[PDB]
Amino acid sequence: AKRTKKVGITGKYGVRYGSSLRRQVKKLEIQQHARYDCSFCGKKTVKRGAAGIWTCSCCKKTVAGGAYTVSTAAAATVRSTIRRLREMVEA
Amino acid sequence: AKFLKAGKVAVVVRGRYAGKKVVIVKPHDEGSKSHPFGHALVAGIERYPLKVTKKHGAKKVAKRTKIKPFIKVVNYNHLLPTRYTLDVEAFKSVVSTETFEQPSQREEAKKVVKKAFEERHQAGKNQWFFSKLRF
Amino acid sequence: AREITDIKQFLELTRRADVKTATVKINKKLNKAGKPFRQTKFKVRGSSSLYTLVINDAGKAKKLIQSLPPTLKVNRL
Amino acid sequence: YATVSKTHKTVSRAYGGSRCANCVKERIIRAFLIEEQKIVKKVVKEQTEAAK
Amino acid sequence: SINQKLALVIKSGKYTLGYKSTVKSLRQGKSKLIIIAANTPVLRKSELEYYAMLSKTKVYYFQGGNNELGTAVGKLFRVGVVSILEAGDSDILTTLA
Amino acid sequence: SKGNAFKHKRALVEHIIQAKADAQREKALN
Amino acid sequence: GRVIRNQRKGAGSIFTSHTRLRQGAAKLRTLDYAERHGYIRGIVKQIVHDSGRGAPLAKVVFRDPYKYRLREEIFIANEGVHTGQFIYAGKKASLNVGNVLPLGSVPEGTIVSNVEEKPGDRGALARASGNYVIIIGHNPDENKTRVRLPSGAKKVISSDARGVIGVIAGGGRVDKPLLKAGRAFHKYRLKRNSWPKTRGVAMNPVDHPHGGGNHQHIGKASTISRGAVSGQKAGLIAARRTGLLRGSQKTQ
RNA sequence: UUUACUUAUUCAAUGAAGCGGAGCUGGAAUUCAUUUUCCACGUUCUAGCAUUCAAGGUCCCAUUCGGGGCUGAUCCGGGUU
RNA sequence: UCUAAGGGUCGGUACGAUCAACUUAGAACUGGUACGGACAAGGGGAAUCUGACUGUCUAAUUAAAACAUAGCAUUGCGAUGGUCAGAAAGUGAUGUUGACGCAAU
RNA sequence: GCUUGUGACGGCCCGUGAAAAUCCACAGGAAGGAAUAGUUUUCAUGCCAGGUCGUACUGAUAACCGCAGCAGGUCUCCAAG
RNA sequence: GAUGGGGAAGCUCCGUUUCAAAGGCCUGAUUUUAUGCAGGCCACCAUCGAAAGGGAAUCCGGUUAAGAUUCCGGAACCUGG
Ligand SMILES: [Zn+2]
């Protein structure tokens, strides 16, 4: 049974801190507590500890990512343009 | 096809001999009461000969080139086959299933494998087999 | 603080040239499901530890005291 | 550990009392495969320039 | 593409899934072609290449991770390497792969 | 039984006998 | 009057940095013969968190070229860098994320971080979490590289200065509200004694120039000249503009 | 008012390790008598390994068990950069 | 004074036996209508002013609407620097720091 | 059941929650070595030695600090029905 | 908080691996005698700082007017040689 209507994970904060401040924390706390795919082993075992550090549960591969998401959208387009400039060296 | 035969050199990767090169002598492809798994009888190098130079003369050259062999039945999953080969009919008959089972014949078997490995280290035969694997 | 099971090696402990005292302890214990028997303990005082021999048969007890060397101070009980 | 004997602090293997017997197998396979590839790496290069 | 050729060998031929059984089939020389996922670890990937070189077995590199390699062979679990023993109606052994 | 599905031990045994009856009675018509 | 709060910070008695749990000074590898003529390979053994730092650290180990030993360096982890990945540092290293290259040997528009100001100082710019610089143009003769600093300022530095390819990990950290003083307490508990901050307008005239009066007001202009004296520089110092700007930012 | 300089002075780094100059080897490169010029010059699928004044090659000792040069590893200048 | 339900171990398409837990629910009967019997143990509601809240201070007359706070905003600074310390110094704090930072409001 | 130890886990962080002495193992193969006998004191047993300073009692409505044998203040462990 | 150094008329201040020529370690040669000299190593570079942190190793019974995991009896363990 669904217990809360809209607060979700931020129900621990009660009525404090305001609705809008609690709403933007909810978006980032869901991201920082969810699991992610491991690019190396293919398992849904990536979890966050010590923000900026993302450790696969098995597979022991530790990947440095964003504070609350495993891949920052700013870093995603940087990884593409660093990749794109690399083909201009050998070819 | 079948590349686990009496000629091929294999590397043991599990148990007291991991990282040591052996040669398969009698491959038992499938089935045995004492070993319900695919296995092979191998002869390997326990103590590799040491690096010898021309400065060493006539007393420790015979000492740095002392090879200590061993005979062992090894599972196929515990072997790492190579593309190299080693001539085996020199000591093919001295090692078999009966050299164990009253181990008193193992020491008789190891002496023949030892002196055969001494003379093939001589005259530059199979120099990769007598080189210790560094890991 | 160390138990000895074999009788033959226990005699070699008594002639170790460092032991000088030995005790014989008589205990009254019950059988597993029956009449009480005579359990004896032969204790050798070594330099570093104490070696004990628990003999549960009274017949073995009387002929093992005969095998004790006369150069050992045997303390009964 | 200084008081207890040798057999309680090691096992009869290469990297016995230092590794967990699975990383040993990984680093022997890796040692064999890289060095085998290393001599394949040079036999490719040996005539690559000679066949220009 | 490769995908529909992999669908024929599942229902018309005999195959093998997993790393341990692929090596067992490759030592016995019963395998004709092995297919390796893209996210397979290189140490394991390089060992399968060396094993196939000893047995003169062709190696095909699947353009996808093990999550979709199992989907190709019609399995809900992930398969890191697929071993082909005897092909059926497919022509994968005669195609460019 | 993880959610609730069974209020005690006796309710699970009764649901086992009834489900096994539903398993063999459909086998007779196949 | 009395010595005001910002003057006491220079004495360094209770205002020093809390450095017990820090993992060490995050610096690049020392510039040697290998880096300015070839490359050197390093292994990321573990990614660890640094106390008081928003960005994670990377412990990369290198082989000493002159002695048989292992040299463990402390790099700042970039996004995408993982444990066990080979890191190549030097002039001839490839253009991959995590590698350390001189800025003279990278193309225009390259995104780099942990950038040296002067060659050999082991990283001075683009160092906090989520920050980077952009390589805007080169200059072969009179060798200098023009970069775009995170603040938006344009700087000219030597082409021999090294830099790590990629963006510093831990970005988006300041996008989450702390929601309470307690979470802000633990944040400054590991950096220095600079929290909480009492307003100078609520103080006494001895404690702050803004203190005193029957109402809480500054009394005079809060824009303080650049040539002022210690004890007077309270508020906006050398401000060329005040108030809320109507419009946008990020000057082109 | 600009510009240049060896060093005075100032800043930084490194248990001051490879700087500067020339020469080899190859090639891009073009010859209008021959090189009038320019860059390269052992490591990038992989969480292995790399140390005993270095093995080899060649030359000496007084053969004996070993010891020493050149090369391997271009030369020149002592300005740590 | 009773009733019902909640378990364990040996033999499990003829399932009865046997040992071990205080938990809940229900029904009669009974009394000088008493029964959380001592002990223990929330007064509540309708509004206004004010500070968001937790927190903090005038030890020994003022605990508050005061301070702090999260949030919001402004300013300075790319190190040959910003802010500050020291009589001086081959001196120091921020700084084991580098703009998602530090410093000042 | 109470107290406590411990194990495998789970939650929390823009907080991920000491250092060193010290001990051990592994890699490495320097050196040292047997057959008419040499090599082991991380196997067992046997032998010797272990100094200096503190050690009583109170720890509080009477042994501490408060002018005191002051209803004040002062850290902690053990915890029956 | 010394030393090397740098300040300060000076009492003293800065600074702690710091712009320093900042040392002893395994020994092997010696059979004139004691520890000269022969190689190779290691560059950490004072010291102070916890009777609640780190840490080699003891228990039981008995005993005094007042002491004990310290004495006695029995049974152990560690370190050094
Ligand atoms: Zn993984």
At B4, phi and psi to the nearest 5? -110, 85
Q: Which residues between 20 and 79 in chain B have a beta carbon less than 8 angstroms from any beta carbon of chain D?
A: none
Ramachandran angles phi, psi of G82, nearest 5°: -130, 165
Q: Which residues pair with C7 in a beta bridge?
A: none
**Residues E65 and E39 sit within 8 Å (Cβ to Cβ):** yes
Identify the contact set of chain E against chain A, taking CB-CB distances under 8 A. Answer: 39, 41, 65-67, 78
In whole angstroms, what is the distance from residue C54 CA to residue C52 CA? Answer: 7
A vs E contact (3+ beta-carbon pairs below 8 A): yes
Instruction: Name the nucleotide nearest A32; use CA and C1'.
Output: J13
Helix, strand, coil % over all residues of chain C, rounded to 5 = 20, 40, 40
What residues have CB less than 8 Å from D27, skipping those under 6 apart? B135
| Whole-number Å distance between alpha carbons of G131 and G150 | 6
Rg (CA), chain D: 20
In three-state form (DSSP H/G/I as H, E/B as E, the rest C), the secondary structure along E35-82 is EECCCCCHHHHHHHHHHHHHHCCEEEECCCCHHHHHHHCCCCCCCCEE
Q: Is G113 helix (H, G, I), strand (E, B) or coil?
A: strand
Cα–Cα distance measured from residue B127 to residue B120, given in angstroms and rounded to the nearest whole number: 9
Probe site for chain A from E39, E45, E62 (most A CB atoms < 10 A): E39
Beta bridge partners of G146: G156
Task: Name the percent of chain E in helix, strand, coil, to the closest 5.
Answer: 40, 20, 40
What are φ and ψ of residue G43, in 5° steps?
Answer: -115, 125
d(CA A70, CA A79): 14
Q: How far apart are CA G162 and CA C61, in angstroms?
A: 89
Of chain A residues 50-89, which have a CB less than 8 A from chain G? 50-53, 60-69, 71-72, 74-75, 78-79, 81-82, 85-86, 88-89
* Beta strands at C73-76 and C37-45: parallel, antiparallel or unpaired: unpaired
Measure the CA–CA gap between C68 and B66, rounded to whole angstroms: 53
Cβ of B80 within 8 Å of Cβ of D12? The answer is: no
For G82-105, b/e burial (b = at least 16 CB within 10 A) is bbebebbbbbebebbbbbbbbbbb
DSSP label of B134:
P
CB pairs D-E closer than 8 Å: 10
D32 in Cβ contact with B11 (< 8 Å): yes
All residues of chain D having their beta carbon less than 8 Å from the beta carbon of residue B74 are none
What whole-number distance in Å separates Cα of residue B130 and Cα of residue G73? Answer: 38
Beta carbons within 10 angstroms of residue G175's beta carbon:
13
For A49-68, give one letter per residue: b (16+ CB within 10 A) or e: eebbbbbbeeeebbbbbbbb
* Residue G100, φ and ψ in degrees, nearest 5: -110, 115
Nucleotide nearest to G69 (CA to C1'): H51
Residue G89's nearest CA partner among G66, G112, G108 is: G112
Helix (H, G, I), strand (E, B) or coil at A75: helix
DSSP SS3 for D44: helix
Query: What residues pair up with G78 in beta bridges, in sequence order?
Result: G168
∠A56-G52-A47 over CA atoms, to 5°?
Answer: 15
Alpha-carbon distances, residue B29 vs B5, B32, B101, C11, E24 (angstroms) = 9, 9, 21, 56, 11
* Alpha-carbon dihedral C37, C40, C41, C42, rounded to 10 degrees: -160
Q: Is G43 on the interface with A (CB under 8 A)?
A: no
- Rounded to whole angstroms, the Cα distance separating G118 from G210 reads 41
CA distance G113 to G165: 6
CB-CB contact of B133 with B19 (8 Å) = yes
- The tokens describing C11, both together, are 């005699």
Taking residue G127's Cβ as centre, other Cβ atoms within 10 Å add up to: 18
Whether D22 and chain E come into contact, CB under 8 Å, resolves to no
Name the helix (H) or strand (E) containing B118. Answer: helix B104-121
Residues 69-128 of B with CB under 8 A from E: 76-77, 81, 83
Closest CA to G199 of G11, G1, G5: G5
Give the H or E element holding residue G47.
strand G39-48
Answer whether D37 touches E (CB < 8 Å).
Answer: yes
Bridge pairing between strands B20-28 and B8-12: antiparallel
| CB of G158 nearer than 7 A to strand H | no
Contacts of F27 (CB under 8 A, 6+ apart): none
Tokens of G23: 């993992």
CB contact under 8 A, E67 and A41: no
Residues in chain D within 8 Å Cβ distance of B11: 28, 32
Contact present, E9 and E88 (Cβ < 8 Å): yes
Question: Strands G162-165 and G111-113: what pairing?
Answer: antiparallel
Residue by residue, DSSP assigns A7-72 as -GGGGGGTT-S-HHHHHHHHHHHHHHHS-B--TTT--S-EEE-STTEEEESSS--EEE--SSSSS-
Residues on chain G touching A21 (C-beta within 8 angstroms)? 177, 179
The total number of structural domains in chain D stands at 1
Give the rounded distance of the alpha carbon of G67 from its chain centre: 33
Residues of E in contact with A39 (CB under 8 A): 39
Give the DSSP H or E segment for D46: helix D23-48
Query: What are the boundaries of each domain within chain C?
Result: 1-77
As a whole number of angstroms, the distance between CA A13 and CA G91 comes to 53
> How far is it, in rounded angstroms, from Cα A52 to Cα G81?
11
Residue G159 CA: distances (Å) to CA of A90, E16, G139:
22, 56, 8
- Residue E75, CA distances (Å) to E10, E31, E71 in order: 10, 20, 5
Alpha carbon of A42 to ligand 1 centroid (Å):
6
Select from D24, D30, D36 the Cβ nearest to the Cβ of B18: D24
Nearest to G164 by CA among G80, G83, G84, G62: G80
Q: Method used for this model?
A: cryo-EM
Residues 6+ apart with CB under 8 A from B6: B24, B25, B26, B27, B88, B92
Select the residue of E24, E27, E54 nearest B83 (Cβ to Cβ): E54
Q: Per the structure block, which two tokens stand in for D15?
A: 């990297």
d(CA G93, CA G114) in angstroms, rounded, equals 16
Nucleotides of J under 7 A from a protein CB: 12-18, 23-30, 33, 42-47
Q: Are E82 and E73 in contact (CB under 8 A)?
A: yes
Partner-chain contact B76 E27, CB within 8 Å:
yes
The Cα angle at residue G93 between residues G89 and G94, in degrees rounded to 5? 130
Q: For chain F, percent helix, then strand, then coil, each to nearest 5?
A: 55, 0, 45
Residue G189: CB less than 7 A from any atom in strand J:
yes
In G, which residues are within 8 Å of A17 by CB distance?
177, 179-180
Q: Compute, in degrees rounded to 10, the torsion defined by CA atoms F9, F10, F11, F16.
A: 90
Minimal CA separation from D7 to chain E, in Å: 33
> Options 3.40.50.300, 3.30.420.40, 3.30.1330.30, 3.30.470.20; which CATH number does E1-97 get?
3.30.1330.30
User: Pick from G71, G113, G129, G86: which is nearest to A53 by CA?
Assistant: G129
What secondary structure letter does DSSP report for B60? S
Which token pair is D45?
């290069």
Burial bucket for residue G115 (CB in 10 Å: 0-12, 13-18, 19+): buried
Contact E12, E90 (CB under 8 A): yes
Chain E residue with the nearest C-alpha to that of B38: E24
User: Could you tell me which of G29, G64, G58 has the C-alpha nearest to residue G43?
Assistant: G58
